[model samples]
Target chain A: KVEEALKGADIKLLLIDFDGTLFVDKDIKVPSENIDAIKEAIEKGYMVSICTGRSKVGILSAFGEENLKKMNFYGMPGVYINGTIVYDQIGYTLLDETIETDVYAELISYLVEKNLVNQTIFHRGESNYVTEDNKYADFLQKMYSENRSIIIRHNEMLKYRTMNKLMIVLDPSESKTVIGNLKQKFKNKLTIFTTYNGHAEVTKLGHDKYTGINYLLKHYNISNDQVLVVGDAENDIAMLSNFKYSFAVANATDSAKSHAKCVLPVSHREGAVAYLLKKVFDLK
Target chain B: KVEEALKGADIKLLLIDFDGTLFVDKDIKVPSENIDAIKEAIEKGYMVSICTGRSKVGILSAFGEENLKKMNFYGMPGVYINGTIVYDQIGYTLLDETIETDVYAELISYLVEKNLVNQTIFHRGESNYVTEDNKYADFLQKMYSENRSIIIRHNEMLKYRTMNKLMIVLDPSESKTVIGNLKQKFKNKLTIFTTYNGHAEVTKLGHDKYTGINYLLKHYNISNDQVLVVGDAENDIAMLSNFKYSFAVANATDSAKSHAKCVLPVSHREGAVAYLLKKVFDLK
Candidate 1:
């Protein structure tokens, strides 16, 4: 039953995550092997669009963007920044939702009042703003890395603008507790959740992986049964649980894997993405 | 005659630059007076859009993104990254160009092989990539600051993606001459020019501030005679020279002023933007 969608592939749109789906968690480059599979699939008339928490610039850093402009999602590329933004590699936004200016100001003021300015990073696409660089900044400075983390006085920069996402990266032990209190206050205004690797990310409410994928699904005139989704993180759970043929790679968390009907035989680092491609396309 | 547009304006779209035009150079905050003027102008039914080298994220930092999403340029916010990318604060790209993948690969190889990796920075929208944080990174961390200056090993990250712009920030004295030599090799493939502040910037060929503005001009069904263009930099020269009602603030360089029909009596620091608004619309 889990292998049903693997036969005579009816999938039209291939929605995917980046870090743990297309490339290994920390991989700097997309394997040419996987690239080849994508090319083969594209040649066979299957459409491809990456669904990732990474910014557009980050995704373009891994998979080449030349193929993205070629895909058709109402001329929109795919959902990014965990669905806070939607645009193509060529630069056309189909849909993007941002935190309300009042909400943004309120959030920043609250963070500042808590003396947590330095502990949080406000994201505007790929460029995140923080008071200074620390271990969290280092994680983004590496491959599959987020670039251009600008250090600023958080209190001063806490004004109205288009905020894409906000992340609180601190000591993991104390972080969840901090976010829990935040959730109690902002649950109605924002979507607050933890990333698979323990970072708590905040984006706009009603904008998630499922909505983003569903956006493509409706626009592309496809359905869950005709989709092949793959991811290995908490963020991917939404799509995994909602889609008919969603997958979680071997290294995926227990919660993430349990939400999927099938867990890949290999991990991301072990070319789990390639395995998915091979299985779905029935490639030799 | 210089104040003719000031009387009962026929203008509908007000396209202006960020630094040295809207706000003084080095300003972190837009004065409330200017914001009030902008509000007044918008209430009068003039559409506002910023045209500058700063990315979409950078523009949003200065001006409220809420107002941006409210404007109409076929629903695009403005031109940014010195015309390499076009997107709204809402995360929709109207038009964006990149250094071709082959060109990008070749450029990186050249920079790396020449051991100039550390001296150069590659931009992908608001985020920029560098081998290390230097004075250039520091400059961006401040007001109208560019965020997310990712310290990357340039050699390893020289692959294909949608590269918006590349900058070489070094001692200003030797930069121009260096860009000249580079222009000899990449003249046809890229638009190589010195920024007003002395840094060398490279973007795709034919994608300049003028072309980007022209794009909006045609799409918005507005004409040069009906548009108000203001700026104060080397990059702004393209529009200053082409637009009919272009203005260079008193603080503008000789070359920039020479390209414009009028130079404002006040400089950017003295609310030259407000002056332009008052003059164009005949506001009090």
Candidate 2:
């Protein structure tokens, strides 16, 4: 009966996760299937937007500056981080002050006390982080800051209005200890996710992708029924929680699929988006 | 994150309700919004199917017999009642002998007892009953015979399924007696629902659109995820249970909406199907 009850429910908007859902690697390559599917859906007159946790730095690495500016990224066409929308028309940009001050301080104190090797400290509005010295510090700083957006004083970072997501590059061997220590201090106060075994990122509690996307939906006046999600890693889990329908591409980690509504047969390289476009979009 | 998750999620296969999602009485005639939506969905590459409880006879009255034959029906797409597509591509039909015999004998027995008036009997093979003294008896007969696919003989049906669902067909005065008697027999098993004084239907355990759809999906080799549903009645409730997404049209009853993930704001006449197609198919 419940199945019959939902037979004709209307969907109003479509949402997508960045990184895994869009570009899969640092080269900004996109699958043909995903591209076609998205294009087709847009043809059908439905509002389509991307919901990614990436800030300007992560975005630049994924899309490259040229392609990023060329693509639709603001207003209804684009949604960043957690429903954090930037509308060039209205000059609206959602910024979180707590992350710049409280959150950054928390992460910094925990990481510094450990004196962990090859550690990188991040600040808001910047991609590269200052590295720990003792010989490895110089190399670490260069390694972390090689492709960063900017460099700023660690102490002055808190003055910034908001902090973007922080990527902590750690040694493969030191990961377990690093994760354990961070988890112990932060516990449930913040969200921790691993993209690769040796890499992790932390976001504020109640500030995961789900909160972000929901916020965007409210801003755009899009209804929940209209939204659909796709993701591939542990960090993407929170974003999928409230989305009514979602697909986990073949590349998705087991942790991500545990919360997904659907798993796409195609891997990112296999053209999942394109396949979806044909199967799901109403091409005009 | 949500936008990225929903990027390709907007492409949807529209499974809809013919009787209520698209059609409502417009001055004694079911207007054209329902048809337009179906046509548009088909044109848009979003597969279209109905989840109604009307027999083929009843449906043909609204559309045409020839047009119905051309569309995809659940399993028996060629010939059926109440969305029970049964005709094989090669012309062989899926024969549900158990249900045909069981329902016919039971319905006839009750009608012959003089306990029930309007003794119209409908069958699945044929949409309308040939019996004399018709009072939209075709509607009752076709639904009972053809559209009502599953016949549950469960002991607790009346108490659990019937009452909670509000399934029945009777005028107000007769409804009182009918409900009273049914309650006495079924006790907590029977529940009566009314559109007004003149109409109602019955729901038995194990026999519903949800089970039937699942059955059809299996028989057709269509994965459960590929299955979509749409309907707008108490009978249509079962179809809603099995889908990841479903909607209630403007004409849907309040009870129906409770189970729906979303409700379309447009009236059927305004071409809700087209609007929805634009969403699921991600049309521009």
Candidate 3:
């Protein structure tokens, strides 16, 4: 029964989202069944990649050392953090774009004046920079500690190398309105992605998970028809909408589901992707 | 030079705090060195346990599956979430305290009326209850999904078993005033522990990490002199103050450091506890 289904399948490219699709909570542990399935898919000649909203460091920590060492990741702003031995210590920027310095300057000034910027991490060349006396140093200290990148406080951070991404932490109360206004102001120039917690990841326009996955598929000589993408959040929408074999977990919001071609019967914790993979692979 | 420190050591009980102590951030992956040090100490004939504010499920998820299988944990309100094969899948309530029903009734009523309660997780036995039509259903869904305990919405949640603890999410604007008033009203009856994010963990008086550690020490016939404790938050004060050999990480709050016997030279990400352990264990 299983082998028959596997023979009928054409999913040569498997792209999975992390939070909500594989990991469900703050603790961020993937199910054992899901982990095994992913490994098996790779062994079966599938090109597996992670397309997530997490940063390179975020993806590594979320998956842990061992699990990550065998996976390829498309992280924040479409950066590729390699897990294979050959490129294990290096990361490649596939679609690096950042808010124009002048625009970013204005944004930071406004945030500082309103005391709304709870925290900020400016990414540049494998290092993250923040002001020496940050308003939210306590919060950021907890956030960036195990990121495996150099984090230093600099008074002249604005003079650092061009930023690849700018993550800003904001309070929930005015977050939506603030992001909306900011988006309208920079409509064609920047992309602002917000999380449930009101943290915003600002990047250059025309670059996202969709763009990154497309790039990966081209590099691997795979078509959208051969791709299987599963996700469960707002950030996953782009890739889900672009892929032909997109699946939304049962717990995904209605908005997220609308972009997917199919809905998984199980939630992420119940091994949504893994369950689906077993059916596709015809595995017992 | 480092081995000299171990020769003079007599510690036999090792208790660690989660969050800032072992787990650094929201991702919750402990440093490899820290994990190795704890495993080494356990192998060296020391009784080790996690004394944390996290729930049993939180500890397991934070440590991930493999690491959790070998560890024992003291969760919210000093309850024991089992470890070791013999005690696996069993949880023991070493200390269970609940807000008097009348007090809880009034509190919830007030929060509901004011729409001040962003979210509420009522701990009863192994389940957490919320209304079926929670205003924060989206948020609660993410929060409750990974909790092994059942999550059933009930208008009659208050009529369920007495709570072991009440976790209430709040808005920053009103959180301080609300908690202050609640504390004043229930002084000597309840212990209100607040996190930086405006959430409160309410339990009974004389119950916390300190009390839990004390219980475990007596249960295992260990004394304070033979104990080594590490922590880095407000909730850690009690245990840090009570123990003879206590260390606070570099990232700990100023108030938390004042109560510790020593302060680690590095932050948790720099492997604070692991670095200190190497000094005390004289390990290379």
**Backbone clashes counted, model 2:** 88
* Per-residue accuracy of model 1 over A1-284 as CA lDDT, tens digit each: 33553644567777777777776645546665667667777677777777877777766654446544443222236788787777653556756667766557778777777766676777775566766533455556563544546676544565546588887775678777888888756643566778765777888754577666655655666755577888888888777765656788889888888777678888877777767877777622
Measured against the true two-chain complex, the DockQ scores of the candidates, in the order shown, are 0.01, 0.01, 0.01
Rank list by TM-score: 1, 2, 3
Residue B182 lDDT in candidate 2 = 55
Evaluate candidate 2 and give its CAPRI docking class based on DockQ: incorrect
lDDT of 2 by residue, A1-284 (tens): 21221233355566667666666553336554555566556556656666665554444444444443444333344545443333222445543423424445666666557754234544344243553242333432233222533444545543444445555667788788778777656542455666544666665543455545544565766654456667787767655543445667788888676556567777776766565544444322
For candidate 2, the TM-score of chain A alone versus the native chain A is 0.76
- lDDT values for all models: 0.68, 0.48, 0.60
Give me the runs in candidate 1 sitting further than 4 Å from their true place: A1-284, B5-9, B27-29, B63-76, B88-91, B133-135
Candidate 2 stretches greater than 4 Å from native: A1-9, A36-40, A65-91, A95-97, A100-103, A116-118, A121-147, A152-162, B1-284
Q: Give lDDT: candidate 1, residue A245.
A: 66
lDDT of 1 by residue, B180-250 (tens): 77765553346676876777788875457776765565466775446778888888887776555678889
The residue pairs found clashing in candidate 3 are A2-A282
lDDT of 2 by residue, B1-284 (tens): 21221232333344556655645542323344445555555666554444454544445555545444444333234323333344343445452211222323443344446344343233334422223343443443254222322333322222221111222345566766665565343321212233423454433322344433433443555543344454466756545533435566666677666555456676556665556555554523
For model 3, how does the per-residue alpha-carbon lDDT over B124-225 read when each residue is reduced to its tens digit? Answer: 444455655555544423443234434454556645534656667777887888788776554434557886467777764435676456545545667555
Query: Between candidates 1 and 3, which one is better according to TM-score?
Result: 1
